[PDB]
Amino acid sequence: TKGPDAASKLPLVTPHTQCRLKLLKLERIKDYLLMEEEFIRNQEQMKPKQEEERSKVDDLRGTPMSVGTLEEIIDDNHAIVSTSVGSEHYVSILSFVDKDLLEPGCSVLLNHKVHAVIGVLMDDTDPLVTVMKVEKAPQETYADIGGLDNQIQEIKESVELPLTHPEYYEEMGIKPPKGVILYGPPGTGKTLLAKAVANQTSATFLRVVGSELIQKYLGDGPKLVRELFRVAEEHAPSIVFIDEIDAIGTKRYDSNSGGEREIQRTMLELLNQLDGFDSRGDVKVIMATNRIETLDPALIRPGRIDRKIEFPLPDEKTKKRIFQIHTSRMTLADDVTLDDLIMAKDDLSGADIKAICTEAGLMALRERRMKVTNEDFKKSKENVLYKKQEGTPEGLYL
Amino acid sequence: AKLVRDAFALAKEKAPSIIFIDELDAIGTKRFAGDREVQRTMLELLNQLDGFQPNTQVKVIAATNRVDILDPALLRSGRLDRKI
Amino acid sequence: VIMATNRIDILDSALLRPGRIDRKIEFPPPNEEARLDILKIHSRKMNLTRGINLRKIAELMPGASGAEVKGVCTEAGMYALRERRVHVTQEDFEMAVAKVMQKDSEKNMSIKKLWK
Amino acid sequence: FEALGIAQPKGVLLYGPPGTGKTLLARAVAHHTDCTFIRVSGSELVQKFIGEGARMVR
Amino acid sequence: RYDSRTTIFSPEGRLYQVEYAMEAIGHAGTCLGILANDGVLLAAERRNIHKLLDEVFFSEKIYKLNEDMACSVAGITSDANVLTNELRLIAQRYLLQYQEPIPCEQLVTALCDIKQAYTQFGGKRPFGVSLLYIGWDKHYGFQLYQSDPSGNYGGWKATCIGNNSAAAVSMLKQDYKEGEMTLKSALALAIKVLNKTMDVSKLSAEKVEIATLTRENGKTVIRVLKQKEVEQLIKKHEEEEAKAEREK
Amino acid sequence: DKPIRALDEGDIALLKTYGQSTYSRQIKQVEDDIQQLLKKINELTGIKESDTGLAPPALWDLAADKQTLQSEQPLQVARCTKIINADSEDPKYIINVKQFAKFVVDLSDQVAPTDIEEGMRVGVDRNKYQIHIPLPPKIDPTVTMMQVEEKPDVTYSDVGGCKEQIEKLREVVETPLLHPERFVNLGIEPPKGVLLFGPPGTGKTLCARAVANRTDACFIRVIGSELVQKYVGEGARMVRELFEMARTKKACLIFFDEIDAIGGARFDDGAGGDNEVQRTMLELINQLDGFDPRGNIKVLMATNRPDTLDPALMRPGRLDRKIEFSLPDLEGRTHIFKIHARSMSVERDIRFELLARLCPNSTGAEIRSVCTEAGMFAIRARRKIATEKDFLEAVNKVIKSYAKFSATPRYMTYN
Amino acid sequence: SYDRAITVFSPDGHLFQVEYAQEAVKKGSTAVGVRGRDIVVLGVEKKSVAKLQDERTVRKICALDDNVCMAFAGLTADARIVINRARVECQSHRLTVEDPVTVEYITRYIASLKQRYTQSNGRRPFGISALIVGFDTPRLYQTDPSGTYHAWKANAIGRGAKSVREFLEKNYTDEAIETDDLTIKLVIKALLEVVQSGGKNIELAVMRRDQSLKILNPEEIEKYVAEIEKEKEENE
Amino acid sequence: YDRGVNTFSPEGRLFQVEYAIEAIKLGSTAIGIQTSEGVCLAVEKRITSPLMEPSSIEKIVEIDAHIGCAMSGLIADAKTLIDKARVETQNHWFTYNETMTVESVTQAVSNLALQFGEEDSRPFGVALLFGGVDEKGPQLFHMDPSGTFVQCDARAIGSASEGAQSSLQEVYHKSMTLKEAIKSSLIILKQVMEEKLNATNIELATVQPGQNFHMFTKEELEEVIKDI
Ligand SMILES: Nc1ncnc2c1ncn2[C@@H]1O[C@H](COP(=O)(O)OP(=O)(O)OP(=O)(O)O)[C@@H](O)[C@H]1O
Ligand SMILES: Nc1ncnc2c1ncn2[C@@H]1O[C@H](COP(=O)(O)OP(=O)(O)OP(=O)(O)O)[C@@H](O)[C@H]1O
Ligand SMILES: Nc1ncnc2c1ncn2[C@@H]1O[C@H](COP(=O)(O)OP(=O)(O)O)[C@@H](O)[C@H]1O
Numbered sequence A: 001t002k003g004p005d006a007a008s009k010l011p012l013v014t015p016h017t018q019c020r021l022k023l024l025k026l027e028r029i030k031d032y033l034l035m036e037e038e039f040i041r042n043q044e045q046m047k048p049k050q051e052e053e054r055s056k057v058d059d060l061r062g063t064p065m066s067v068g069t070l071e072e073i074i075d076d077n078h079a080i081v082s083t084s085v086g087s088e089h090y091v092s093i094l095s096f097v098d099k100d101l102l103e104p105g106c107s108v109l110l111n112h113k114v115h116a117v118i119g120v121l122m123d124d125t126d127p128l129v130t131v132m133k134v135e136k137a138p139q140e141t142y143a144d145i146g147g148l149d150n151q152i153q154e155i156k157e158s159v160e161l162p163l164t165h166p167e168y169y170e171e172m173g174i175k176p177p178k179g180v181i182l183y184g185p186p187g188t189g190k191t192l193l194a195k196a197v198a199n200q201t202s203a204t205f206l207r208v209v210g211s212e213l214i215q216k217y218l219g220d221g222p223k224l225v226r227e228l229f230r231v232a233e234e235h236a237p238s239i240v241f242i243d244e245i246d247a248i249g250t251k252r253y254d255s256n257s258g259g260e261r262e263i264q265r266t267m268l269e270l271l272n273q274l275d276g277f278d279s280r281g282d283v284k285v286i287m288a289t290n291r292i293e294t295l296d297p298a299l300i301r302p303g304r305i306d307r308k309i310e311f312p313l314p315d316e317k318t319k320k321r322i323f324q325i326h327t328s329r330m331t332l333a334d335d336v337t338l339d340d341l342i343m344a345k346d347d348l349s350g351a352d353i354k355a356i357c358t359e360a361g362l363m364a365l366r367e368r369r370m371k372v373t374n375e376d377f378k379k380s381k382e383n384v385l386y387k388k389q390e391g392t393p394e395g396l397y398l
Numbered sequence B: 001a002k003l004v005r006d007a008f009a010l011a012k013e014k015a016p017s018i019i020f021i022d023e024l025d026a027i028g029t030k031r032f033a034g035d036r037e038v039q040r041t042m043l044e045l046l047n048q049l050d051g052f053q054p055n056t057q058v059k060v061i062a063a064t065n066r067v068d069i070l071d072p073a074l075l076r077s078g079r080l081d082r083k084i
Numbered sequence C: 001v002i003m004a005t006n007r008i009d010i011l012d013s014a015l016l017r018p019g020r021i022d023r024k025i026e027f028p029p030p031n032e033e034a035r036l037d038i039l040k041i042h043s044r045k046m047n048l049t050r051g052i053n054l055r056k057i058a059e060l061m062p063g064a065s066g067a068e069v070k071g072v073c074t075e076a077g078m079y080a081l082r083e084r085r086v087h088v089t090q091e092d093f094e095m096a097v098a099k100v101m102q103k104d105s106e107k108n109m110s111i112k113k114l115w116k
Numbered sequence D: 001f002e003a004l005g006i007a008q009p010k011g012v013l014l015y016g017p018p019g020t021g022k023t024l025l026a027r028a029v030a031h032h033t034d035c036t037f038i039r040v041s042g043s044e045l046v047q048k049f050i051g052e053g054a055r056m057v058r
Numbered sequence E: 001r002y003d004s005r006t007t008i009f010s011p012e013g014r015l016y017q018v019e020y021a022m023e024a025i026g027h028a029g030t031c032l033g034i035l036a037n038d039g040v041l042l043a044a045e046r047r048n049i050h051k052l053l054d055e056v057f058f059s060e061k062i063y064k065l066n067e068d069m070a071c072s073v074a075g076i077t078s079d080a081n082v083l084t085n086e087l088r089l090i091a092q093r094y095l096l097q098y099q100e101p102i103p104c105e106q107l108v109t110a111l112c113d114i115k116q117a118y119t120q121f122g123g124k125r126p127f128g129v130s131l132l133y134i135g136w137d138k139h140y141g142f143q144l145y146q147s148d149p150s151g152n153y154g155g156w157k158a159t160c161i162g163n164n165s166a167a168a169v170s171m172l173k174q175d176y177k178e179g180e181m182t183l184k185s186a187l188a189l190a191i192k193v194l195n196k197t198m199d200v201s202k203l204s205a206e207k208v209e210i211a212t213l214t215r216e217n218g219k220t221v222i223r224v225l226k227q228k229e230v231e232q233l234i235k236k237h238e239e240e241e242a243k244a245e246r247e248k
Numbered sequence F: 001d002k003p004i005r006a007l008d009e010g011d012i013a014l015l016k017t018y019g020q021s022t023y024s025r026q027i028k029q030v031e032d033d034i035q036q037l038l039k040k041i042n043e044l045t046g047i048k049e050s051d052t053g054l055a056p057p058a059l060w061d062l063a064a065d066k067q068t069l070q071s072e073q074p075l076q077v078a079r080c081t082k083i084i085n086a087d088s089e090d091p092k093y094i095i096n097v098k099q100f101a102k103f104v105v106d107l108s109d110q111v112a113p114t115d116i117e118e119g120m121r122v123g124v125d126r127n128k129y130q131i132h133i134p135l136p137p138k139i140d141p142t143v144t145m146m147q148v149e150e151k152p153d154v155t156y157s158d159v160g161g162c163k164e165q166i167e168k169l170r171e172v173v174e175t176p177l178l179h180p181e182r183f184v185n186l187g188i189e190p191p192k193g194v195l196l197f198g199p200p201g202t203g204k205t206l207c208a209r210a211v212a213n214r215t216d217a218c219f220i221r222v223i224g225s226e227l228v229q230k231y232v233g234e235g236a237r238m239v240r241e242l243f244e245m246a247r248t249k250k251a252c253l254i255f256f257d258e259i260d261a262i263g264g265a266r267f268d269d270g271a272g273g274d275n276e277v278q279r280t281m282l283e284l285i286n287q288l289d290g291f292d293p294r295g296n297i298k299v300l301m302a303t304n305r306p307d308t309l310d311p312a313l314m315r316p317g318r319l320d321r322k323i324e325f326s327l328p329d330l331e332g333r334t335h336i337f338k339i340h341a342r343s344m345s346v347e348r349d350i351r352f353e354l355l356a357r358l359c360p361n362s363t364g365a366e367i368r369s370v371c372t373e374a375g376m377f378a379i380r381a382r383r384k385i386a387t388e389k390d391f392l393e394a395v396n397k398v399i400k401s402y403a404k405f406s407a408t409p410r411y412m413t414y415n
Numbered sequence G: 001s002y003d004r005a006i007t008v009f010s011p012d013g014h015l016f017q018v019e020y021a022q023e024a025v026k027k028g029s030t031a032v033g034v035r036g037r038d039i040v041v042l043g044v045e046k047k048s049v050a051k052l053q054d055e056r057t058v059r060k061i062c063a064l065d066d067n068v069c070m071a072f073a074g075l076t077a078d079a080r081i082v083i084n085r086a087r088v089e090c091q092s093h094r095l096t097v098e099d100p101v102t103v104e105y106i107t108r109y110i111a112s113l114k115q116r117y118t119q120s121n122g123r124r125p126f127g128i129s130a131l132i133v134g135f136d137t138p139r140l141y142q143t144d145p146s147g148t149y150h151a152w153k154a155n156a157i158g159r160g161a162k163s164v165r166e167f168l169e170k171n172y173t174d175e176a177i178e179t180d181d182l183t184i185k186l187v188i189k190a191l192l193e194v195v196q197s198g199g200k201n202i203e204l205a206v207m208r209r210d211q212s213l214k215i216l217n218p219e220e221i222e223k224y225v226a227e228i229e230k231e232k233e234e235n236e
Numbered sequence H: 001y002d003r004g005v006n007t008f009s010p011e012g013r014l015f016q017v018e019y020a021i022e023a024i025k026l027g028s029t030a031i032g033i034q035t036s037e038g039v040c041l042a043v044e045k046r047i048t049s050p051l052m053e054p055s056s057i058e059k060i061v062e063i064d065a066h067i068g069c070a071m072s073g074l075i076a077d078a079k080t081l082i083d084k085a086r087v088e089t090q091n092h093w094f095t096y097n098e099t100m101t102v103e104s105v106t107q108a109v110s111n112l113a114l115q116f117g118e119e120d121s122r123p124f125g126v127a128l129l130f131g132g133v134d135e136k137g138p139q140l141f142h143m144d145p146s147g148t149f150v151q152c153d154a155r156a157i158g159s160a161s162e163g164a165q166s167s168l169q170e171v172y173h174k175s176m177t178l179k180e181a182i183k184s185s186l187i188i189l190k191q192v193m194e195e196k197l198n199a200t201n202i203e204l205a206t207v208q209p210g211q212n213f214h215m216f217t218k219e220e221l222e223e224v225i226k227d228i
């Protein structure tokens, strides 16, 4: 089974104000951590059997242990095993090995001298895949996202609600959506939403770049994708986030480009994993891309990617929410009227609002002030907002 | 290259032998590190063609769907020349 | 991350967004006082002769790059070297400016007169 | 920045006409940084190979 | 791409060829127009000023369409020539039909309509010429008008097109007083804005031509300023700059 | 403007002190020691002992394992390349040790010369390389895992709107197997290959799953990632061994899912291109048709981009029948809607013909997504029955919300 | 691949250039128009002109004839051409037949003229949509770059179309157009739902029964805006 | 092959007219039934906004006092064809002092339609249902962008054409009366419409031999509707 390896996270300490309540909650966290440290330190200290078992098994197998590939199972205790050098050896299977675990192609621990099967290596996970697993959940939560109520609701119905409440889906008869593509202009909150869902989820989370799943050697790309998805299968409730799928999701086309055909083969293996022969199981996929129109139709089609969540440039209410969230830790003055920044049509995104807040803080620091003002925000708006050149036509239209 | 040499030697051992090389585009691809090994195989084949000369009973027929991919050195004069 | 590049408008607006790049610092061609500062900076080790007014040299360089100022100083030094001297004169600086400020026009009045 | 509540700025893009001191300013920063100043050109991360540029960036 | 033909709408509804002509107008020489009480003037830069070019027309950028009208020019030379000739033809046709000078605005619209045609019918490239119009009539007095390659026009009191048009229009926005501007103040403003917009320093007079329009005893005289008065205008501007230097 | 003044050390100290410091220092120190404490716990536990093949104690309980270790000796696997047979009394045997070398050895006295035939694989001792035991013929592991051995639960009643495609498929992969006598009587050799092609999500993989569900023969779901191997010529050998395994089974079925991966177009103007992938594709071409007749191996190939395939592969001697899956008609889309809404808790008054007509150009996958979205809408507002309005909203959300930019003012052009 | 010509049907029967022509309207400033029992009113988002620009030439409300006026949204030059053609056709119709041109007839002519530029290649379609209001009975029609006209009790075209229409449907009541001042106030409110500057960017033209056009000066519009604000001040 | 009206395909098909039928498919549903008692003709209105005057949606037009027409597809092409039909009817009356037969009216409209490419343009992307009484009796004709036209006892065009056509085949016989034809058309329209059927989402028209007048229904629609 090998249930999910959910990322560990400390409880959120709120209020975020530098008050005594935050001190008390943080000191409660420190208290419990010290309790855990004391118990885990005095556990092995007071430890006075299985040592005979270890002294027999380890002595019999000996060190070092070679790692080979099982090729054939001839007898109940004899196997043809190929070493990493590609040389096959007819070796013996020692008694202290589960015969049901031995399968062709499995990674098998052999003795160094006689290469006899001393055990089976379970994980044998590519290091480029085990690094995709998330161990420390990101600090961003659903409370750090301003607006985006529809997008958050869709992503929760897709990858969150089925885990907590599969009762609705089972009762009505729907198979819950198992693929979501977060597409929109950059800086709108796609990666932020991925961070938030990773923080909230109780299922294992795999983060991919859409470009680290691509390897030098000819066949290692699709093989790496298959390994990643198999690992996702192992920890049954899983979420596989592939940021910037544009890297491999680009539309298929015919050209010589010996590397591009491997690119397309890798993406073909990806879409086979998403929806092909054999079921995919209880593993959700979240994909993010700035440009969706350049993606291959067979990748973003329903059944492979069930939902296409659009992240538009924030509107007035959403922008006001972003400003309220990102100046929450600030010390605003009384003359500040955030509205003037929220209005007008600068086409500023959530990342733009974050930079506006940061630059207003820097402007206040320039005047040796730890509290921001309206003038600082106004200066920061023009200082940071200068991104696009023209983006507009002339006075043709009345 | 060993396979090509052994096949040609087996053709030599039998007096009336006909070699049939299908899909010459695979090993007859123009040169440009598996390219090195493919070149070794193709040049061994070329040497085998250059080997026999006294109108020996060993004759070879090559079939391909592509001629542009085929190495022009394969055609030459003392090698496969009957472009049927 | 510090990223330096010309052609600000040709790099995609995906690394240009505020999250990836928080500050976009423009390096306009040096103004007159900036050109004076650059001239003073790059002539520190050059043995200048009294009557080497660098303000007038900055006037004679209407909107250079800043590397062109260093090239101007280098070419004045080259004229001094070719004359086998170690000092630099004002006329030397002005004519070095003229050489470094070599502009290539269309040289085809037919093309220039297309746009009336 | 922690007390202000803002997030520390990360990226600085020095853009302008050529020969104005962008990489000169980068060199000056590298001289007084008391910190690691890994340098990258715009063409060292290309490679002829698929996924090698991304791997080298990583 | 949707810019191969003038009659192809972009998916966002933008005529890319028309916008290309508008942006190409920026290549043309700077020409500016200022309205003022009892006067209206155009100024232009001679651009190509090579010593082997004889100056025999004296009005390479300013043209007289009607008795009480004049136009500037900024765009393709051939398109400018045909547009000016056709402007004169329209004005003379109106005068022949009605025995009354064409009231400025209509003339603009007339030409503009024709330009619009070149942006609608296929097989014809849009007129890559934008031009200013100055005039006077019995309805709205002195008028200044701005045209576009698309055939769009607009009334203005002070506007410039060509090289560094944005800087000129910003300077005019800063240094124009609606209602209380005269011909002399307008000429000084035009000289200073030309000096700032033209990268060349000291604004040598032979590189700039100024043509004014004024009403004199019901004769609506259109004058093109000779070099001699531009010398004294440049000297006046230099002496005002020297006087402003006194603050330091 | 006024230049920004520098931030002197006194200013830094004032800004970091002239403010909240009653609990700021304590809060920051507590957070830092919290992080350090977490690191301490993680380090001090820090094992997560990896699972190894250690059997339960009662399973082995064997002190004779060491006796097996020291007494028995390892044997390297090598195929006897040739029988020298010098005088049939000292025959000698040329063997090939995979990639190590090739040797001239003799059998140990344990085995008989008649039991060691030419070409088979045998175990040799590591010292004198003498033959010690005959071995079963090599079976590639990944090739045997390429088989399915587990019929999916997709029947033929779950593929709506593709009646012609299903019948033409069964005419090539089912009918010539269950009832061959219907063909030999008419002297017709049925097609031995089918290429399933069409828009994505039209049901090619679903039909392949149904075929595997009721094949009754050997079904091999070829993985496109395994024919693509790191080493030169290993993919071609993969194809050879796959076809040999198929020939071992009586009248096997092979399904090359997503054939575009290894079915590109051959070229040389790219200065090398793939070559290895092209060589594997060429060997597959050779196995499909040519000398050495393929046999009773009906081949299934699916791809939703067929125009990039090699014309040699597309030639109707390897892929004889070309079944095309098209966008379902109105009746087919009604059938798909009924199929995918069968298990849903919906009303009995849903006019599925209306919904099918509301999705003119839509694949079966889009119909399934519409049904799932209707269920999602019925779940959002917690109703236990999905009504017609939910299905209409789902159709708008799935088809219309992403079809085109033809807005209603622009859609007023048609009436 | 089927959007580079006007005479090519898309595989799903779409004339994509004709559809693209409507984006030019979508890029224009909002123009709203309603009809009352005795008046026809039409407001315009009069975007602020430059400081030195004369706003006399910038006209969006143009009177086709003494009994019918028209406000466009889209390309300004195409609008000028269409307005001139409509004036010429209305005068010609008055010449041929004594009775004045009906608003329905002039809208039919404008729609046919726009359509005839979408039937031939090498002829760019008009990129404007028009609201034509007149008396024959107060009638309001809207054209389309495609060449289709429609009769409406109330529209709004241009930049704000969905928002202003959404405001309009649940605001156009029988009592809303009961009084002429009520209808003008409704137009002002509908325009203010999109034009977020107030007064300075609002231009409303009202044509009464058997009367002439009257562009509302920026003092009567200011008074109506103040009255609307006073009426809306009942929330507190 | 699918870029001009003058390019033939390897199969011989013109891949431009078929696109015009596709343009038809996204119009609005129109049912027409011809019975010995007359012709009935129903259309779904597809109202877009309450502000929009419903009388502006001209899905039903009067070609003459005896012949009416229903469109489906582009408004511009349909109105051009309808004006052409009216002009031909008036010209035939002028030059022959008789009412043009609906077959001849459809012939004239089709003759205009076939000229999509004839001169050294594009097909009219609209199907027309011409109902009306002539010297031989009531008649119903259907015409498509290619200019092919045929008499149909009961024809459905626009969207929902397939389902409405199937139900029409199920529920149509030769000896239907006008009232039962109206009822069948209305029930089919209700079953093929996403919006609830009422007096404002559909319009009805009918022609009778001796009752050519009243070539429409105005507020008697509810009379048939609530007696469904
Ligand atoms: N709706 C939002 N609410 C709160 N913060 C936001 C929002 N949108 C963006 N941000 C802020 O912007 C930062 C950067 O945005 P993010 O990482 O989500 O980019 P993105 O949308 O994934 O863009 P890209 O196309 O570059 O991947 C986030 O860390 C977050 O602080
Ligand atoms: N006729 C149909 N009836 C029912 N479901 C269908 C039908 N056609 C397609 N589907 C649905 O489409 C889903 C995905 O389609 P499928 O896996 O066959 O894609 P494909 O067309 O082979 O695409 P790819 O190009 O990725 O190979 C299936 O899970 C199935 O539910
Ligand atoms: N402000 C300046 N002061 C002094 N030297 C400068 C300045 N700007 C540019 N330079 C000169 O320009 C040269 C390098 O310019 P560089 O930084 O490469 O420009 P860019 O980054 O635009 O290519 C240096 O030798 C430096 O001396």
Ligand SMILES: [Mg+2]
Pocket: A187, A190, A191, A192
């Ligand atoms: Mg992101």
Ligand SMILES: [Mg+2]
Pocket: D019, D022, D023, D024
């Ligand atoms: Mg540099």
Ligand SMILES: [Mg+2]
Pocket: A275, A276, F201, F204, F205, F206
């Ligand atoms: Mg598939």
